[PDB]
Design a protein around this ligand. Structure first.
Ligand SMILES: Nc1ccc(Cl)c(Cl)c1
Length: 452
């Protein structure tokens, strides 16, 4: 029984980043102890606290003293605010590390989220191995590493490009579908994004939540050893488990509803927390589901201008065919149900991976962050989903919503899309087995943290 080396994790964004980070740490237990050094700009949300306090004991949490973001623009994008949050928390992170080291504990590694590269400077000064955890696609990681070159060769706004951007090892992406922070090169968000991308080379390794079976092109290009590019460790798919072994409780009503429906016949609609639609956009979706014969399980949230904000008599037209849920739903238990045949998601990488892991074809409805690049890679790259076309007014009309739903649940492309999605499902469980490619990646990262 040797002492467990300690590891500090520095998350960037909200719950969407803690989940994969937590699963990453949970899979390295009990070889190491962990501490979430969580930067804050205010009282941590009850969601963050309740989640982190439910992790195993070996994964501690330390909410760093909150910082003042009032001097940042009121319209600052989230990437700008997150970068300032880490920078203004480095003294706190220095003290947190100083308390563990002062006690004789070996701090073996600092794992910084994709927008916490400024914390690598602390790890380098203290002789700690800096690693970067990328809770997104290998495609987007390739975009980060290529962003420096893409900036030196393109001068105009990316949405003004005629040809798609050619990222090493990835499929072409039009400038309008590039990640949000690059859509305005005059905004501080783009300067920060460039700042971090240039600093990825400072890490001894990038841990990306993806695997080769899911992104053959980008992964093989990332694994290509080059000077000035860090080693990459594909450890995906990292997703939470369902209520299969996470507590004992009574069956939710929505799951009982799925039990009575046929196999692969229900379309699960959920844009996730922070995936709010406009009243007009929500009406279009509500109109198609009202007049469709498709079975749906829809998680609804109040628009930005909730089951009473739905159109007139919507619940009357969709009684036993569909089931509306307010705000929240057990996403993983739904996706694992046999009656779920499709998933209309915002393409958040956690939601995407949970759908790939259970072999559920997607309706790619990207919204923000890198979801549009995830939609392109899923629908046009892997051919496991359909993307409704957005109009010039930002609204996705019912004609497109009904089109993709129809081609997916019925039709022959939805027949090929499902078969292809099953191949990825079997591949996802494969890379996570004792003979898996990702099981090795974790093992190798652990050995590096234990090396010397
Ligand atoms: N906010 C945000 C979260 C994740 C990613 Cl991969 C990006 Cl590009 C932005």
């Amino acid at each position: 029984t040797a002492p467990p080396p300690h590891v500090i994790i520095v998350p960037s964004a909200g719950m969407g980043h803690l989940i994969p980070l937590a699963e990453f740490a949970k899979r390295l237990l009990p070889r190491f102890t962990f501490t979430f050094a969580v930067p804050t700009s205010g009282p941590p949300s009850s969601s963050q606290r309740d989640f982190l306090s439910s992790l195993p004991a070996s994964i501690d949490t330390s909410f760093l003293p909150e910082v003042d973001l009032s001097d940042a623009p009121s319209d600052a994008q989230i990437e700008t605010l997150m970068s300032l949050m880490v920078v203004r928390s480095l003294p706190s992170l220095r003290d947190l590390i100083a308390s563990y080291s002062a006690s004789g504990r070996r701090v073996a590694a600092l794992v910084v989220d994709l927008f916490a590269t400024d914390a690598i400077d602390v790890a380098l000064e203290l002789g700690i191995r800096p690693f970067i955890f990328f809770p997104s696609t290998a495609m987007t990681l390739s975009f980060f590493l290529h962003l420096e070159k893409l900036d030196e060769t393109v001068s105009c706004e990316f949405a003004e490009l005629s040809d798609p951007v050619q990222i090493p090892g990835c499929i072409p992406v039009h400038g309008k579908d590039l990640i949000d922070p690059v859509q305005d090169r005059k905004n501080d968000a783009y300067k920060w994004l460039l700042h971090h991308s240039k600093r990825y080379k400072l890490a001894e390794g990038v841990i990306v939540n993806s695997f080769e079976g899911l992104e053959g092109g980008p992964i093989r290009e990332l694994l290509h050893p080059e000077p000035g590019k860090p080693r990459v460790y594909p450890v995906g798919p990292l997703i939470q488990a369902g209520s299969c072994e996470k507590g004992a409780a009574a069956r939710p009503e929505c799951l009982k509803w799925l039990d009575q429906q046929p196999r692969g016949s229900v379309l699960f609609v959920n844009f996730g927390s922070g995936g709010v639609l406009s009243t007009e956009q929500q009406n279009e979706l509500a109109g198609v589901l009202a007049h469709s014969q498709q079975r749906f399980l829809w998680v609804v949230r109040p628009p930005n201008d909730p089951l009473k904000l739905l159109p007139e008599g919507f619940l009357e037209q969709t009684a036993g065919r569909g089931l509306v849920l307010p705000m929240w739903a057990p996403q993983i238990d739904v996706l694992s149900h046999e009656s779920t045949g499709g998933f209309l998601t915002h393409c958040g990488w956690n939601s995407t991976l949970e759908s790939v892991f259970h072999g559920v074809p997607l309706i790619t409805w990207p919204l923000y962050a890198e979801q549009k690049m995830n939609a392109v890679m899923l629908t046009e790259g892997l051919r496991v989903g359909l993307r409704p076309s957005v109009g010039k007014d930002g609204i996705i009309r019912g004609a497109e919503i009904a089109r993709v739903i129809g081609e997916l649940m019925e039709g022959e492309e939805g027949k090929r899309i499902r078969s292809k999605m099953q191949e990825l499902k079997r591949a996802a469980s494969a890379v996570l087995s004792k003979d898996g490619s990702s099981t090795r990646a974790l093992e190798e990262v652990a050995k590096i943290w234990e090396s010397k």
